[PDB]
Design a protein that fits this description.
part of a larger assembly, 5 chains, A: about 50 residues, mainly alpha, about 45% helix, about 5% strand, globular, B: alpha/beta, eight-stranded mixed beta sheet, 10 helices, about 25% helix, binds a molecule of 2 linked components (NAG-NAG), binds 2-acetamido-2-deoxy-beta-D-glucopyranose, Glutamate receptor ionotropic, NMDA 1 (chain C)
C-alpha cells in the first residue's frame, strides 16, 4: 500500500532496511528501545496497549 | 576426436591459419586420434551442405563440425538442426546464419551456437535504457519470428518495473507496407527513441520509409539488435546516422579466436569425457540406409583458459561478449559498449548524438539548467547501489567531480535529486512543456564579481 | 514451359486423381498461357535421403506449394520437417496435410508453414463448447506431453479468459512414467470431476490402467479425450461410456487432398492476378538470391477466401488452419463407437441417441460436490490466533473466561519456527 | 521475469487451502486475482511509540 | 466549459492528416461547421473511424 503511493517512497526505503518477520518482534524491539515507531493496524495496538 | 572445420568467405578468413591452429595447440593430448580438417566452400545452398555433411561423416567418422555462415539465412542453422536430428553429432554454429537468434532447439538435438538468447540482449538494451533514463520509448515489431517471447519479456519487465516506464501499445506490421495504414502506425510513434524488431530486408524497408517520411530526427533515436542490423562484413544502403546496434560479432575478438575457443571447448569436453567413458567415438555410419554417451549433459560448465563460455539449457553461452556499436557519417561500425558477466560497461560515458544525420536541426526543447545544493530546496543523493535507479519523483543530474587536486580530469557522476525546486522544475516542465538538462555547479557557491570576474 | 507442383505421395490412384485435379485446374483460366506438371516422391525410411530427394526434385522444379501426404508412416518420429526446411531457404510456404502438432503450428521455428487441418487445441474450444453444453466451470486438466501441452494450456487459459474464469488444477508430467496415480488421487480430492486429457497412446493406456486401479471410472466422472486416445490399446483400455471426438473428412485422405489442391490452384491463380511474379531460383548451382515475393505470397495465401469444398467452407485463419469445421462426437457403448453428437462452426447439436455416461443414468452427472470438508489456514496473529503446544499429547487445557465461559478451542497443525 | 505469491495466498492459490479466516488486509491488488468478503472488522492504521 | 482546441480542415481529405485530426477528438459534443457534402464526408469518415 505504501509502494503504490507516489510520494511515500522515502518511508518505503526507510522501512525496507529493517523488515521484521512477526509483529511481536517489533513489540519486543520497541519494548527494549531497539525501534522508535511501527506502522500497524489500530485495534490490535489498542489491545496490546 | 576428429573435427572438421569448414568455412565460407566471412571476415576474409583464409585456410592456412586454420592449418596453423592445431600445431602448438593440444600439447597435453590424452585423446590420441585427434585430427583437423580445414576446408572452404563457395556454395552455401543446403544441397551442398548436406553433401559435405555426408562426406565428412563418411570421412573416417568425424565427430566435430565447426561452420560459420556468411549469408543472411538463419534457417541454415535450422537445417543444421535437421542435421542434428539425424547425425546426433555435436555441431557448433559460429558465424552468420549458423549463429543467429534462432527460435527453439530440440531435446533430440545436439547442436549449439555462439552467443546468447534474445532475452539477455533485451536485458542489455533495457540496462542501456536504465542508464540513459530514456523512459519514453517505442516498440515497433514485424511478423518476423522470435517476437512473441521478446514482446512478452518486455511486457513482463515493464509490468514488474521499479522504474515507472512510460509505454505505449506495440506497433505491429503485418505484411509488406501499403504506406496507407502502416504510415499511420509510424505516425503513432512513441517519442525519444525507436526500438525495432524485424529482419534485414524488413529493416531496409522500414528505414527507407522512415527516411522518406523523416522519422530520423534528433529526438527519435534508433536502437536495434543484431537481428535487425545484420552481418558485419557488408553494410546495406539507406541507414540513418546514429543507429545504435547490439551484436556480438567482434573484429578484435575475430572469427579465428572464436573457432579456436570452439576447438578448445570440443577438445576439453573430449578429454573430460574420455577419462569417464572409454569408447568415445560413436557416430552414425553413413547417410545411406537408416547414441547414449553424448556431450548433451556433460560439457555445460565448460571453461577453457578462463573464458566465460559456459553453456545454457537453451543452447547458447551464459555470459558472452556483447558489443554495442553505432554508425557515424563515414559509414563505419565502431565499438562503443561492452557487457561484463554481471554489469554493462560504458566507455563513452558522455553520450554522443552524431549530429550529422539530416538536413535541418534546432537545439530546441533542451535547456541547460544548473543549481546548487541547498537543504530545503536542492536535495542531491546517490543513486540506488543495488538497482541503479532514481525513484520517479526524483530527477537525474550530473556533476563534474574532479578526481584529485593534482589532476585536472573530472568525471560526470549521475545523482538523484529531490526537493522543493525539483518539484518546481517538474511542474514547469508539465506546464511550459520543456525538457530539463539538470546539472550542478562545480566552480563553487552562487556567484560573486571577484574584480570583474564572476 | 511448365510449372511443377511438388508432393510427397505414395498411392498411384491418388497420383491419377492428383493429375486429374491438375487437369481441372488447367481447364479453368483459359487466358493463362503456361502449363503445369506434377512431381511426387514416395516412401523412403532414411530421412537424409528424403531431404536429398526433396532438394533434388523441388529446387530444380520452381514449385509454388508443396503437399506432404504420408499419415501412416511406420516410423514413430512423424517428421515432414525437411520439406518445410528446404522450402524455407527462400521462404516458400509448404501446405501440410498430415499432422496437427503444435511444433508444426508454431510461427517461430516454422516460418510460413501452413496446412489444411487445425491443431488439437481448437478441440479444447470444442471442449469449451462442451462447457457451453453442460454449463460446467470447475475443470481438471491432465496433459502428458509438454510441446503441445503448453499450446493447449495457453488455449485453455484464453478460453477461460473469455469467460473471465479460472481452472481448478492443471497437470503436466513425464510421458512414460506410471506413478502419477498420486496426482490422480489429488484430482479425486478436488471438488470437480471434469477430466480433460491430452496424451499419446501409451500415456492414455497408462492413465486408463491407473483409473481402473483407483476406480476412477465410477459415478460422476467426466471422461473426455481427443484423437490419439482412441487408437491402439487406448481404444481397448478405454472405459465403456467415454466420450471422444472424430474429425469429419480427417481420415478421408482423397477428398481432403482434392479440396486442398483446389485451394492451392485457386491461390496460385489469385497470386497471378497481380504483377511481380518471381520464380523460385535454381539454388542448386551457387544461387542464394532470396525469393523476395515470400511476404507477397503470404499476403495472398493468408487472405485467401473460399466458398467451395467437398469438406466444406475451407478458409485459412490467422495461423493457416481450417475455419469452422464440423466435428463428430462419439460414445463408446460396450466397446462400440456410437455417434452421440455433431458440431457446427461454433455450436453442438446432439442427435436422437442416448448420451450414456460411465456412472448411472444417461442424464448429465453434476460432478460439483457441495464441499463437505473444507481447509482453513491462518497466520499467527497475536489477538486473533493464539497457538499453544499441547499439555501431554494432542490435548487442550480447557480454561474458562472471567464469566465462566470455556474458551472454545480447536486442534490445529503448525510448525515450530522459521526455516533457519 | 514473473512475480508470484507466497504466504496464505501462496498456500491458497496452490490448492493447499480452501478458505482463509485471518486479518485480511483488504487492498486492490488481491481483489484483481481472488474475491473478497464483507468485512467483520473495521480497522485502520496507526503508529506505536514509547 | 471544457472546450477542446479548434480542429481545422483545409479541403477534402488526404486521409493522412485529417484522420490524425479526427483522432484528436475525445469529447462528447462535436461542433461541426462545413458544407452539406463536406458534412456527409466527415460523417462517413467518422462512421469509418467509429
Ligand atoms: C567474468 O566472470 C568471471 C568468472 O566468474 C569473473 O572473474 C572473477 O572475478 C572475481 C572478482 O570480481 C574474482 O573473485 C574471481 O576469482 C574471478 N574468477 C575468475 C577465475 O576469473 C569476472 O569478474 C567476470 N567479469 C568480466 C571480466 O567480464
Ligand atoms: C506409484 O507411486 C504411488 C505414490 O507413491 C503409489 O501409491 C502409494 O503406494 C504406497 C506403497 O509404496 C501405498 O502404501 C499407498 O497406499 C499408495 N497410495 C494410495 C493412496 O493408494 C503407487 O502404489 C505406485 N504404483 C506402482 C506402479 O507401484
Ligand atoms: C561465392 O563467392 C562469391 C565471390 O564473389 C561471393 O560473392 C559469394 O558470397 C559466395 N557465395 C555464393 C553465392 O555461393
Ligand atoms: C553446472 O552448473 C550448474 C549451475 O551452477 C549446476 O546446476 C550444475 O550442477 C553444474 N554441473 C556440474 C558439472 O556439476
Ligand atoms: C585519487 O582519488 C581517489 C578517491 O577519489 C583515491 O582513491 C586515489 O587514491 C587518489 N589518487 C591519487 C594518487 O591521488
Ligand atoms: C589543492 O591545491 C590548491 C593549489 O593552490 C591549494 O590551494 C589547496 O589548498 C589544495 N587543497 C584542496 C582544496 O584540495
Ligand atoms: C513432368 O515431370 C516429370 C519429372 O518430374 C517428367 O517425367 C514428365 O515427363 C513431365 N511431364 C511433362 C509432360 O511435363
Ligand atoms: C475401488 O477402488 C477404491 C480405492 O481405494 C477402493 O477403496 C474401493 O473399494 C474399490 N471398489 C469400488 C467400490 O469400486
Ligand atoms: C473417405 O475416405 C475414403 C478412404 O478411406 C475415400 O475413398 C473416400 O473418397 C472418402 N470420402 C468420403 C466418401 O467420405
Ligand atoms: C511491382 O514492383 C514494382 C517495383 O518495385 C512496383 O513499382 C509495383 O508497385 C509493384 N506492383 C505492385 C502491385 O505492388
Ligand atoms: C458444415 O456445416 C455447415 C453449416 O455451418 C453446412 O452448411 C455444411 O454443409 C457442413 N459441411 C458439409 C461439407 O456438409
Ligand atoms: C451452426 O452454427 C450456428 C451459429 O450461429 C448455430 O446457431 C447453429 O445452431 C448451428 N447449426 C446449424 C447447422 O445451423
Amino acid at each position: 500500500y505504501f509502494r503504490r503511493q507516489v510520494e511515500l517512497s522515502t518511508m518505503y526505503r526507510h522501512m525496507e532496511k529493517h523488515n521484521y518477520e512477526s509483529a511481536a518482534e517489533a513489540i519486543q524491539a520497541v519494548r527494549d528501545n531497539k525501534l522508535h515507531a511501527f506502522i500497524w493496524d489500530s485495534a490490535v495496538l489498542e489491545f496490546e496497549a | 576426436l576428429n573435427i572438421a572445420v569448414l568455412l565460407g568467405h566471412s571476415h576474409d578468413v583464409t585456410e592456412r591459419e586454420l592449418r596453423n591452429l592445431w600445431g602448438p595447440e593440444q600439447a597435453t593430448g590424452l585423446p590420441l586420434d585427434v585430427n583437423v580438417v580445414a576446408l572452404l566452400m563457395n556454395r552455401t545452398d543446403p544441397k551442398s551442405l548436406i553433401t559435405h555433411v555426408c562426406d565428412l561423416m563418411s570421412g573416417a567418422r568425424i565427430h566435430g563440425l565447426v561452420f560459420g555462415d556468411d549469408t543472411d539465412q538463419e534457417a541454415v542453422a535450422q537445417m543444421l538442426d535437421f542435421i542434428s536430428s539425424q547425425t546426433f553429432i555435436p555441431i557448433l554454429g559460429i558465424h552468420g546464419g549458423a549463429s543467429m537468434i534462432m527460435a527453439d532447439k530440440d531435446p533430440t538435438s545436439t547442436f549449439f551456437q555462439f552467443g546468447a538468447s534474445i532475452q539477455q540482449q533485451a536485458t542489455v538494451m533495457l540496462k542501456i535504457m536504465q542508464d540513459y533514463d530514456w523512459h519514453v520509448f517505442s516498440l515497433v515489431t514485424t511478423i518476423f519470428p522470435g517476437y512473441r517471447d521478446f514482446i512478452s519479456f518486455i511486457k513482463t519487465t515493464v509490468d514488474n518495473s521499479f522504474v515507472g516506464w512510460d509505454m505505449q501499445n506495440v506497433i505491429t506490421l503485418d505484411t509488406s507496407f501499403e504506406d496507407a495504414k502502416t504510415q499511420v502506425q509510424l505516425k503513432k510513434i512513441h517519442s525519444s527513441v525507436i526500438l525495432l524488431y524485424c529482419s534485414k530486408d524488413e529493416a531496409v524497408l522500414i528505414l527507407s520509409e522512415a527516411r522518406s517520411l523523416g522519422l530520423t530526427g534528433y529526438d527519435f533515436f534508433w536502437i536495434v539488435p543484431s537481428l535487425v542490423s545484420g552481418n558485419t562484413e557488408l553494410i546495406p544502403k539507406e541507414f540513418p546516422s546514429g543507429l545504435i546496434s547490439v551484436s556480438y560479432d567482434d573484429w578484435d575478438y575475430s572469427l579465428e579466436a572464436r573457432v579456436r575457443d570452439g576447438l578448445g571447448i570440443l577438445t576439453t569436453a573430449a578429454s573430460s569425457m574420455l577419462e569417464k567413458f572409454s569408447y568415445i567415438p560413436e557416430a552414425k555410419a553413413s547417410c545411406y540406409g537408416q547414441p547414449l554417451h553424448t556431450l548433451h549433459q556433460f560439457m555445460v560448465n565448460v571453461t577453457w583458459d578462463g573464458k566465460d563460455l559456459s553453456f545454457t539449457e537453451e543452447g547458447y553461452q551464459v555470459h558472452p561478449r556483447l558489443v554495442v556499436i553505432v554508425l557515424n557519417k563515414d559509414r563505419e561500425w565502431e565499438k562503443v559498449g561492452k557487457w561484463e558477466n554481471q554489469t554493462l560497461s560504458l566507455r563513452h560515458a558522455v553520450w554522443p548524438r552524431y549530429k550529422s544525420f539530416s538536413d535541418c536541426e534546432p537545439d530546441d526543447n533542451h535547456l541547460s539548467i544548473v543549481t546548487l545544493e541547498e537543504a530545503p530546496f536542492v536535495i542531491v543523493e546517490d543513486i540506488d547501489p543495488l538497482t541503479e535507479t532514481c525513484v520517479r519523483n526524483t530527477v537525474p543530474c550530473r556533476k563534474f567531480v574532479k578526481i584529485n587536486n593534482s589532476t585536472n580530469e573530472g568525471m560526470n557522476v549521475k545523482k538523484c535529486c529531490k526537493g522543493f525546486c525539483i518539484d518546481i522544475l517538474k511542474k514547469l516542465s508539465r506546464t511550459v512543456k520543456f525538457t530539463y538538462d539538470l546539472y550542478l555547479v562545480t566552480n563553487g557557491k552562487h556567484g560573486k564579481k571577484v574584480n570583474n570576474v564572476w | 514451359k511448365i510449372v511443377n507442383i511438388g508432393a510427397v505421395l505414395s498411392t498411384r490412384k491418388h497420383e491419377q486423381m492428383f493429375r486429374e485435379a491438375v487437369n481441372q485446374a488447367n481447364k479453368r483460366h483459359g487466358s493463362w498461357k503456361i502449363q503445369l506438371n506434377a512431381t511426387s516422391v514416395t516412401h523412403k525410411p532414411n530421412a537424409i535421403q528424403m531431404a536429398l530427394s526433396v532438394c533434388e526434385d523441388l529446387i530444380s522444379s520452381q514449385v509454388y506449394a508443396i503437399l506432404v501426404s504420408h499419415p501412416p508412416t511406420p516410423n514413430d518420429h512423424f517428421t515432414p520437417t525437411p520439406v518445410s526446411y528446404t522450402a524455407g531457404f527462400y521462404r516458400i510456404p509448404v501446405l501440410g496435410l498430415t499432422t496437427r502438432m503444435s511444433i508444426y503450428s508454431d510461427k517461430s521455428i516454422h516460418l510460413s508453414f501452413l496446412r489444411t487441418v487445425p491443431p488439437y487445441s481448437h478441440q479444447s474450444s470444442v471442449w469449451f463448447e462442451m462447457m457451453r453444453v453442460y454449463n460446467w466451470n470447475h475443470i481438471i486438466l491432465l496433459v502428458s506431453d509438454d510441446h503441445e501441452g503448453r499450446a493447449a494450456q495457453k488455449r485453455l487459459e484464453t478460453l477461460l479468459e473469455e469467460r473471465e474464469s479460472k481452472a481448478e488444477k492443471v497437470l503436466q508430467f513425464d510421458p512414460g512414467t506410471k506413478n502419477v496415480t498420486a496426482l490422480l488421487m489429488e484430482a479425486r480430492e478436488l471438488e470437480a470431476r471434469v477430466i480433460i486429457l491430452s496424451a499419446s497412446e501409451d500415456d492414455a493406456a497408462t492413465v486408463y490402467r491407473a483409473a481402473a486401479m483407483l476406480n476412477m471410472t465410477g459415478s460422476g466422472y467426466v471422461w473426455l479425450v481427443g484423437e490419439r486416445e482412441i487408437s491402439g490399446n487406448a481404444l481397448r483400455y478405454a472405459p465403456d461410456g467415454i466420450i471422444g471426438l472424430q474429425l469429419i473428412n480427417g481420415k478421408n485422405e482423397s477428398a481432403h487432398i482434392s479440396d486442398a489442391v483446389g485451394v492451392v490452384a485457386q491461390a496460385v491463380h489469385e497470386l497471378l492476378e497481380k504483377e511481380n511474379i518471381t520464380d523460385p531460383p535454381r539454388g542448386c548451382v551457387g544461387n542464394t538470391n532470396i525469393w523476395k515475393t515470400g511476404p507477397l505470397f503470404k499476403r495472398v495465401l493468408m487472405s485467401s477466401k473460399y466458398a467451395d469444398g467437398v469438406t466444406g467452407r475451407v478458409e485459412f485463419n490467422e495461423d493457416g488452419d481450417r475455419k469452422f469445421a464440423n466435428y463428430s462426437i462419439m460414445n463408446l457403448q460396450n466397446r462400440k463407437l456410437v455417434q452421440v453428437g455433431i458440431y457446427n462452426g461454433t455450436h453442438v447439436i446432439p442427435n436422437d441417441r442416448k448420451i450414456i455416461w460411465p456412472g448411472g443414468e444417461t442424464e448429465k452427472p453434476r460432478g460439483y460436490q457441495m464441499s463437505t470438508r473444507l481447509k482453513i489456514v491462518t497466520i499467527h496473529q497475536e489477538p486473533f490466533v493464539y497457538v499453544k503446544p499441547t499439555m501431554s499429547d494432542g490435548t487442550c487445557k480447557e480454561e474458562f473466561t472471567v464469566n465462566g465461559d470455556p474458551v472454545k478451542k480447536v486442534i490445529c497443525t503448525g510448525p515450530n519456527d522459521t526455516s533457519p | 521475469n514473473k512475480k508470484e505469491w507466497n504466504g496464505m495466498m501462496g498456500e491458497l492459490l496452490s490448492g493447499q487451502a480452501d478458505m482463509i479466516v485471518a486479518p485480511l488486509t483488504i487492498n486492490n491488488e488481491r481483489a484483481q486475482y481472488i474475491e473478497f468478503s464483507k468485512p467483520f472488522k473495521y480497522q485502520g492504521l496507526t503508529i506505536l511509540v514509547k
